[PDB]
Every structure is written in C-alpha cells, then in structure tokens.
Amino acid sequence: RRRQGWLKEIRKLQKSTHLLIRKLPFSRLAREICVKFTRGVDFNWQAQALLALQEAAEAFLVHLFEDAYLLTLHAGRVTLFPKDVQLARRIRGLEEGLG
Amino acid sequence: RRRQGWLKEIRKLQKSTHLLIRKLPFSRLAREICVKFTRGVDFNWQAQALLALQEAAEAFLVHLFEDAYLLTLHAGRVTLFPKDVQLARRIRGLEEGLG
Amino acid sequence: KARAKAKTRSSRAGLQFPVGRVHRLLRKGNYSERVGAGAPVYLAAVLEYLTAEILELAGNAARDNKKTRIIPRHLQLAIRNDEELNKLLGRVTIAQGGVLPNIQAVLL
Amino acid sequence: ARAKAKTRSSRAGLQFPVGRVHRLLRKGNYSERVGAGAPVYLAAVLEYLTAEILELAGNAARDNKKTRIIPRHLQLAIRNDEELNKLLGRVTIAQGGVLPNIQAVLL
Amino acid sequence: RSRKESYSIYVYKVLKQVHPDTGISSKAMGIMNSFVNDIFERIAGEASRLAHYNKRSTITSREIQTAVRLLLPGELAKHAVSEGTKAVTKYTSA
Amino acid sequence: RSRKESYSIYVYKVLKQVHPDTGISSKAMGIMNSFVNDIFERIAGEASRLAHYNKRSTITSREIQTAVRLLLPGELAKHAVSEGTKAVTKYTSA
Amino acid sequence: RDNIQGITKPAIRRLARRGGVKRISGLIYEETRGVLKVFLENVIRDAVTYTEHAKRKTVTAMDVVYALKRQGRTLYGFGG
Amino acid sequence: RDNIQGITKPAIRRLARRGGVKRISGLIYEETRGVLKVFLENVIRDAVTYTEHAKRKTVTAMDVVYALKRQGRTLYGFGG
DNA sequence: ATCAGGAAGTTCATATAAAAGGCAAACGGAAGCATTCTCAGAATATTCTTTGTGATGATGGAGTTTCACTCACAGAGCTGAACATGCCTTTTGATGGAGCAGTTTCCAAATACACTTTTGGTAGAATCTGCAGGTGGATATTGAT
DNA sequence: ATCAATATCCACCTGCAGATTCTACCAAAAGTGTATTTGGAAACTGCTCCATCAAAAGGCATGTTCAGCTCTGTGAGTGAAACTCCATCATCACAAAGAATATTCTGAGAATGCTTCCGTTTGCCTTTTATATGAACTTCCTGAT
C-alpha cells in the first residue's frame, strides 16, 4: 500500500517562497561559468549577486516547467518528457526561449 | 480517382512574396476597427499604412500557424484544431502571444 | 525685503510624491533639452496613483492572509491576481514572491 | 590660408559618414558631450554589419540567377544565417515571404 | 558615505492613507522602490521619444499624457490620466 | 521639398565593393536604410545607458565597444570589435 | 454580410498553406478571425494614439511602424 | 563530479512540483541541467561585460540586475 | 521489368518599368583659434569578500517492489479536400474635388539662469512590537468495514 | 456508512529581529528678478486621400462524394513514485586579513563655441538596362502495368 503525495507536495511548495536550489552548488557553478569569460581571471562575486541571479535562474525554470506541462497535458500524457521542454523553448522563441 | 494537391500548393505558396488577403476586404476591416477608438471621428489612412499594417498582420498569422502546427504534430495529429492555436497563443506569453 | 515663505509644489498640487525630485530627474536624465513645468506634476500624480493601486491590493491580500505587515508575496499575489497589473508587470519577476497556487484541473 | 579639407571618413578609411554619425549622436540626446572616437568606432561597426548582409544577400541573389537584390533575398540571407537570425530575431521584412520548410512527417 | 536618495518615505505616505493600520517590510519597500524607478524611466523614455518623433524640445504635460495612454493597459490608463489632470488643473490654479 | 537625408548612397558604396557586379532594388535599399537606422539607435542607446550607469558625461569609443559587445551575438561581435579598433587606430594615427 | 466575414475561407486556407498546414479543421476559420481582430485592435489603438498626439487626421505609415515597434514587431521597409 | 551535477535530482523535482508537474520522466534531469547552463551562460556574460566596462573585479548586484533587465527579465528587489 | 500524359525546366525575344547617370545648390562638415572642464592619476581609509576550520544535523544516493501509464493496433464513424459551375466582389483607372498637412512670420508667455535663504530628507542613535516556532486541543480527510 | 489515525486548523506565549521613532545637518528645493527662446496661431499652398462609375474576369460560394483521417478501447510492458538508511555535504560561526572598492585633490588633454569657406549630398530630368511575360521545346516525374 502506497498513497499519493504529489498532491500534498505541490500545494506545500506553491505556498512557500524560499529558494529551491541549495546555495553552494549554485555558488560554485556561477563562479565556474564566470571563468570562461574573464580569460582565467577570477572575478569576485558579491553575496547579493549570487542571490540576485539565483532568484532569476529559478523563476526561469519554474515558469519553463509550467509552460511545458501544458504541452504534456496537450498530448494526452501526464509524464513530462524532454520533447515537451524542447518544444516549449522553441515556441517562445529566440529571446524568451533559449536563454 | 482523385489526386493530392496540397503538397503542390504549399510549395508554390512558400516561394512567393505577395499578400494573401485581398486588399479592399482588409482596407475596410481596418477602417471599421479604427472607429471604436476615434469617438466617431473618421480618420484618414494613407495607402502606405494599410499595407504597413497588412504586412504585419499576415506575418503574424503565418508564424502563428507555424507555431501551432508544431503543437498539432506534437499530439499525434495532422489536422490543425483551434485548441492548438489557443495554446500557441498561451505559451508565447502576454506580448508576442495574444494580439 | 519681506520674502514670502515656501510652499512646496507637491503641496500646491496636493500629491504625496516629490515634484521637485521628479523634475530634477527628468532634467538630469537626458530625456530632452527643456522640461515643461507641468510634466513633473503630471508624472508624480501618475506614479502616486499606480503606487496606491498596488499598495491597496497588497493590503487586502495581507489582510486576507491574517497578517499586518506587507511582505513580497503579498505583492506577488496582488499583481498576479489582477488582469491589468499582470499585463503591466508581465515580464517582471519579483524576488521572494513565489508563484500562484495553480494545479491543473485534469489532475484532481 | 588654410590647408586642404580631409573628411574623417576618408581619414579613418571608412565608407559611412563619421560627420553624420557625430551629428546624430549630438542631436539625439544620448548624453551631454560626445567624444571624437565614438563616431569613428560606430561608423566602422555599421559598415561591417552592412557589408555582412549585402554579401549574404549577394550570394542568395547569385544562386537564383539574378543580378539585383530584392527583399526576398534579404529575407533568405538573414534567416538562413545563424547569428543574423539571432540579431534580427523579432523583425518582419516587408515583401519578404517565408523560408521553404515542410515538416518531414507530412511527406 | 554617499547620500543614496530614494522614494522610501513617499511610498510609506501613500501606504498610510489607503491602509492606516498596515506596515511594510524592508524588502517589500525595496520592491515598491524599484517599481517606481521602473515606471518612471518607462514613461519618461516613451515621452522622450514622442517629443523627438515630432521635432520638439520640451517634455510638456501632453507627452506624459499620451505616454501614460500608450504604456498603461486598458482601464488603468483611464484612471491615471484623470488623476494627473486633476493635479495639473489645481497646480495651475495656485 | 525638405532635405530627407539617409544612408542610401553609402549602402550602395559598400555593395559596390562586396559584389562589384550587383545592383539593388529600391525597396531593398529602403530595408537596408531602416536596418542601419535601427542598429544605430540600438548601439547608441545602449552606450547612453552605459555612460549613465557610471556617472559619465561622455560617450567615448569605450562605451561603443562595450555596447557592440552586448548587442551583437557570437562571432559577429568579435569581428565587429576588431573592425572598429582598426579604424580608430587609423584615425588617431593620421 | 459583416466586415470580418470578408477574411474568407480561401484567404485563411492560403495563409495556412504558407505556414505549412496539411489539413485544416472547419472550426479554425472563426478562430483565425478571432485572433486577427485582437491583433488589429492592439495595433490600431497605438496608431491612432500617435496620430492624435501630433494633431492630424491622417494615419501615416510611420505611425503604424511606431505602433508596431513598441510592441516588439519592428517592421522594415516603410521608413524607419 | 562536475559542478552542474550539483543541481541535484530532488532540486529539479522540487522545482517541477512548484511548477505543478504530476509525474516526471527521468530523462528530464539532463535537459534541465542543459537549459540552466545556457541561461547562466547568457546572464553571466553580460554581467561580466558590465563589470569590465566599469574597471572593476567585483560583480555587484546592479550588474546582474542590468544583465537580466536587458534580456527582458526585469528583476525587482535588488536596486533598480 | 514497362508507357501516358501533364508538370516543370530551357531558352530566346521583347516591352517597360525601374535603376543608373548627369548637373545645380544649399547646407553642413572641416580648419583654426580661444576657452573651459572632465576625468585619469596618485594617495589613502575602510569595507567586505575569501578561505579555513571545525561542529553538526539535514538531506540526498542507492537499491528494490508494485502498480499507474505510455504505446502500438484495430475498427467504427465523422469530415475535409477535391471537383463542377455559375456569378459577384475585387480591381483598375480616371478625373474632379476638397479635406488636410507642410511651410513661413511673428511675438509672447513659459523656461532657463544666477543668487540667497530656508527647509526637508537621509544617516545614525534609542526603542517598541509582529511574527515564527512551539505546545497543545477541535476538526476535516482516508481508509475499510 | 463508521472508528481509528492522521493532517489541518487554530488558540496562545514569547524572543527577538526588525520596524518605528527621535535628532544634527546638509544639500537642495524654493523665491526673485533677468533674459532668451520655443512653439501655438494665422495664412497659404500644393499634396493627397476619399468617392464614384463602368466593367471584367477571376476568384469565391455552394453542393456532393469518398477516402483519409480522428477517436475510443484494449492489452502488453515499461518505468517512475514510495520507502529505508546513513554518510556525505552544505550551513553556520568567526577571527582575521587583505585585496579591491570608494573618496579626494590636481591639472592637462580633450571637448566645446564661434567664424569662414568650400565640398558633399540630395533632388530632378535623362537614358539604358534587368526582369516579367509569352511561346514553343524538351525533359521528367508520377500514375498505371
């Protein structure tokens, strides 16, 4: 016997505000990608830039899954496949879509 | 014994540059929708504005059907339904989508 | 001589936003060469109206959420539950705002 | 007496008018004062992008056996090219048409 | 330390004439402070462009009126225009 | 009739050295004219906000360089920067 | 006969063939007329606003181009 | 262990639940890691460009906000 | 593996609309000199970002079962493209015409400018309170009879 | 249709983080004359959009059929959520520390202002050419065999 709890997890995550990616595995990913653009020079990051970029890199992904799950429900499925996300990034376009 | 002609029609229309809606049935639709915003005063249009607005209104619809037909082929269909256009105007957003 | 005392031109118009500061920002921001004297008066009234438009709905959401002080989620809800503020603040993400509590109806 | 006048376009070796770019940066109200190297830089960048698009459009005209570039050829040249499609992304080119692209499932 | 001015004491006065028993936190003060700086440069950038398309040198009240009417959507640019007009017609009568 | 000046005689000079045996029709000259007037108002607007974020009064070549590097994507920017640096070096020499 | 009914079935069919549509449902011919009216309402409102600010009664080409430019639909070919 | 493997499985699941997703395929944990990398590569490049023009070595919050603002992703709360 | 017949590509001639070319004028870009003034540079305080290092409990990684879900397939029934036929909305074009926008002069009221004085807004203190976690009872699901 | 467990909701206590309130003071906003200039107003012209009429034919509206679909249901098999557990990793505190950002004063090279003069750019007739169009030929591609 196993009860469903996806319905109790979506509701407790839609009424909270806090960030859902842990702070340090994002805080070294951003400093890794920042190396390739400064020609090996390590820039310093402020403590309010690694939050003001995580607040946008999660508000992109949550809205991306909200716009791809409409495509998943459109095809008769319920399971979210990568061919849904790759389509929802194409319909949005060059600007709003990729990147 | 009948034959297909849609594949000959798509190819002969995608290599043309002219306009597909006739000139006068659009030139009176635009002048009717103008009256709802000018408080009964009849504005003049130029002849280069009723083409400048038709060139935009058809390049909107062609790209809308190109974005909706991906949704049609996405659900396993071939036939373009209105529930595809109503979703391609929802994923695009508030600006690029509706209107 | 008998130099008369100052009336602020926020108070000559009855606003709450600073017409002097808005005039200086329109003049220093390089928007045009001259700035007419009715333009900061018009623009400060528009900004006061929109600020009241949002803080009223945010106060109603904070009252509905059994609280006193307005937090950023009480602005997120106030903006996204409204058809003409969601259209204005459309491509705007509001930090610590959360999302709307949406579940698709076919799942339930 | 004065010396012979030399244009800044021919001094920098460009083709776009550095004088007109300087006047349109002053009269446009972008900032208070405008330096002397900014129009020389900006005219060079505008000449480069125009020389890019007029070469892809020339190739698309030559591939269609025509010696004059029509807006169809600019639509083709911009949309077939990966980064000019990303620059001119949200741009409709009038009397331009679409790219020939039939979905391969339908064939 | 530089002076670092803002709209923080004015958003508070507008809050405490529509909800006299309600406070606002620091981060929701910052969000309402960034909202005003956004709509300010949005309306001023539209009215800098109306008066450049038409070969003018002055941002008058009329440019701010039609820039409000372009930017603000629907039944909100019907109230904001009246809120600005009833401020200008009582500024000039003083 | 007014002056009505544009970029139509400069786009043609660029065409006569990227393809020496190829003319261009009138509407496809108006499109290149509109393209130049759009890229100009884009690069100069980004340079004007760059000069205004840092409290400068001057749009030098450095703001135009860091506005090309923000607008133009990919290899197109890295070619345009080296196309402009060559021209301002040749200008400051002569 | 109404004016939106002048956007006929061959016109919507022929725009759909340019977009690449193979078979076209019978209910789409009112959905396309519903979308076109919403687009024309959003563009002609700003065309008339830019006209009225300049004190004219003639909507020139630059006013429609400026109405399209500020919605993110930059139109090349009519002066700009 | 690459650093993009620090965007773990339950964090992607936890973002998709806030997005409202009932069931999640297992192949999406690489598509999401490939979309997040492209979003960060487009925002970090413009933040670094705004830093290098100002002759600094510290990436403030204003640089990130100006990078997000110009891609049409205006961020409120960090100074604007 | 074989023919039929229209579809599409070749190719040469030809009008003709459209692009290239020549010539004047006005206007604006350049040379030159006098003047201001912004900003790169040097010296200095001070803020705040990084790295370590330890403590530690919070949470993700790994593996195994079970059942809701995706996918291919077949068959019934709807429906959309194809075809025949008439006829009616588009289109050209054409001149009259009259509402209208672009041009030119003049001047007056609104806008800047410079100086002095008051005054409100920000920064830095002391001080008061909303709320988040905690503890514990009433109540609205979720089975399983 | 009914009893236990449980998840939800709520009633209340309080520590403290954070909002509120209280003060020097400084920049900046406002009042007062001065001067300059932008733009609303009127006259006028020449451009240009609306309206109408005849026609003419081409494209659209309507009916009908049939074959290519959409939809629903079924069953096989795949695969994702639930569950346990513990050890790895992120969080926090913190003393310092030290690079790098922020502030301040200086003068010089770069930018502006003004005058003159001359060379570029655009506008309007004039030719000359590329491209649409026609018309027959030839291939060739698709349905049939």
Author numbering:
A (entry chain A), B (entry chain E): 42 to 140
C (entry chain G): 9 to 116
D (entry chain C): 10 to 116
E (entry chain H), F (entry chain D): 31 to 124
G (entry chain F), H (entry chain B): 23 to 102
What's the publication's text?
We further determined the cryo-EM structure of the free NCPCENP-A, NAS in the absence of the scFv as a control. The free CENP-A nucleosome showed substantial dissociation comparing to the scFv bound nucleosomes. We selected 303,864 number of refined particles and reconstructed a density map at the 3.40 Å resolution, which is insufficient to define the DNA bases unambiguously. We also found that the resolution of the density map only improves slightly (0.05 Å) when the particle numbers were increased from 220,908 to 303,864, suggesting that the resolution limiting factor is particle heterogeneity rather than numbers. Nevertheless, the free CENP-A nucleosome density map and structure fit the corresponding map and structure of the CENP-A nucleosome bound to the scFv very well, demonstrating again that binding of the scFv did not perturb the nucleosome structure.
